[PDB]
Design a protein around this nucleic acid. Sequence first.
DNA 1: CGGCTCGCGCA
DNA 2: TGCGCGAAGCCGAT
Length: 456
Amino acid sequence: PRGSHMNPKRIRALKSGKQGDGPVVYWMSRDQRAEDNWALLFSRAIAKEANVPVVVVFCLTDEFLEAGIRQYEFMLKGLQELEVSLSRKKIPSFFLRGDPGEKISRFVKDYNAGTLVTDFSPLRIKNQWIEKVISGISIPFFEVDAHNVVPCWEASQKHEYAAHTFRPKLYALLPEFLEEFPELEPNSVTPETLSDVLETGVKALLPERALLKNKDPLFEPWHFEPGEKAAKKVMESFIADRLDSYGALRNDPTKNMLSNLSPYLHFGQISSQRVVLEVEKAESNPGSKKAFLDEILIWKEISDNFCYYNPGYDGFESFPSWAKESLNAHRNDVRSHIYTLEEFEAGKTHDPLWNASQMELLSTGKMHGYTRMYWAKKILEWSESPEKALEIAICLNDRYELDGRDPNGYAGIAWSIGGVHDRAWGEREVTGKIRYMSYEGCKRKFDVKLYIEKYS
DNA sequence: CGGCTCGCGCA
DNA sequence: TGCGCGAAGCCGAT
Ligand SMILES: Cc1cc2nc3c(=O)[nH]c(=O)nc-3n(C[C@H](O)[C@H](O)[C@H](O)COP(=O)(O)OP(=O)(O)OC[C@H]3O[C@@H](n4cnc5c(N)ncnc54)[C@H](O)[C@@H]3O)c2cc1C
């Protein structure tokens, strides 16, 4: 609907109806940014055609109680900066608290909304909120994929078994969907405190804070400055200083050669399409560029495909049949070690390498990409059952990772424990044919002692 | 039938 | 360190 630089395949209608006379309402959930936001740009285009203002609404749910302070402050501080950024474009921002199914329905009626637009997320709870809103409103409802370069329903129509079958499909659609972002035109017609929401939330999460023996907090918040502006700086420094050596040193946890974009990419503080555009134009190592593009395009967006077409993405049923049969047969195998959630959480295992991986997660909130596999696969080896291992890994991932509660997390954990998007390997006790990682294998690929000594 | 995002022996 | 082989089931081009 209207616009020359807007691909209609990025927008899909969730509910048809007569368009109202009021402003266009953008229900911002996943892409918390002002620039490079297709959902915000599309909302502005519909508003321009209808000669109505565009507004953004945010619903603060009770889900932050399941998380900790580290995600709350990171997310809330970025929204404060986003509030100023949208204010400069004469776009008002309304921050609501409560159930989005009931709050969004009330906001549309009270504000006399004409059209409702929201971003795309394949998570279960997002689909539940959308259906609740659909039953309570009478205006057109649209959904825009502002997170993936190629829209999730357009890249593939089915669950993808592996990357090698999804890679040609994604790369074929890149020329159509990889394009520059038009600038966000400000509003022409003009028409809760975030500080109070922040101060209340930390008070409710203070008891659940991760502490040391001397009651000192474990989380170090100076490693990643949140916000749209800081996310851009991280991207620029990656291309200039780190992209060249990414291809060779991405699997070395002792070297800070990763992009460190996942906390911003999870909260939508930066667009992966913007990152792809800058990386494509960069003159760097061709092997490094191909390796990084495979990470942010194929593996990031296949995680959306996994969650979109598998409602049980965080369960044992989502595993492939070969993986399920292999794990089932080894249920009665005697485990070399039985560890509980608390012992995993405190880093109280016999493995100093695994403990150091947990400490990096506890202290920085972002464990290195390579050690994340060894972290999750040892949980399977040292748990009562595959279901318990899946529960433990998801719990610690979602509680302590800044990029937690993300499709990349569920696909990554399902890859590690259930062989999702993987293949079978040598038969072993307990883990069966799931891919095996050993402490000695990590020794021959990076300096394990340096990584251990860094995080005690 | 070819080829998939580990460990391991060997220079 | 970097390279080639081994051990496993299966998708997808035909
Ligand atoms: C068990 C396990 C759990 C995971 N949990 C999370 C999580 O909670 N949140 C999360 O965002 N990612 C998760 N991943 C994926 C991966 O660990 C992170 O994306 C990455 O380590 C974050 O660091 P980075 O952005 O600097 O990595 P980079 O090497 O710089 O990667 C760049 C971007 O590519 C994407 N990406 C890279 N590797 C993967 C991957 N394996 N799967 C999917 N996308 C990928 C991410 O968007 C990332 O920001 C997990 C991986 C594993 C093995």
